[PDB]
């Protein structure tokens, strides 16, 4: 068998450890969530600067 590297090859990671799927589903969403919230702070800071 060829060793596909788990850390690059998503489905190999999942084969060896299926809980990866969730862990990576979280920490896309989590990071997006927080990225949105940073824009919202930045918009409030611009509004406070305009005021």
């Amino acid at each position: 068998v060829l060793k596909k590297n788990p850390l690059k090859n998503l489905r190999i990671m999942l084969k060896l450890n299926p809980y990866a799927k969730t862990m990576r589903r979280n920490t896309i969403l989590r990071q997006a969530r927080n990225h949105k919230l940073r824009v919202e702070r930045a918009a409030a800071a611009l509004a406070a600067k305009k005021s």
Partner: protein, 56 residues
């Protein structure tokens, strides 16, 4: 001492070493841990049944 570098590995270090370069000793043949069927077959008599268990 003057023949080695060593110290206290991170969590991530234990993962990266095990996933990228994790090879079983399975009937004395270095064999790459491609599935848990390998780990289990050998270490399952200890409650260790997957890569994750191994890391823990």
């Amino acid at each position: 001492e003057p023949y080695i570098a060593w110290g206290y590995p991170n969590l991530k270090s234990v993962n990266e070493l095990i996933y990228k370069r994790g090879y079983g000793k399975i009937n004395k043949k270095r064999i790459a841990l491609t599935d848990n069927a390998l780990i289990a077959r050998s270490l399952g008599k200890y409650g260790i049944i997957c890569m994750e268990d191994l890391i823990h």
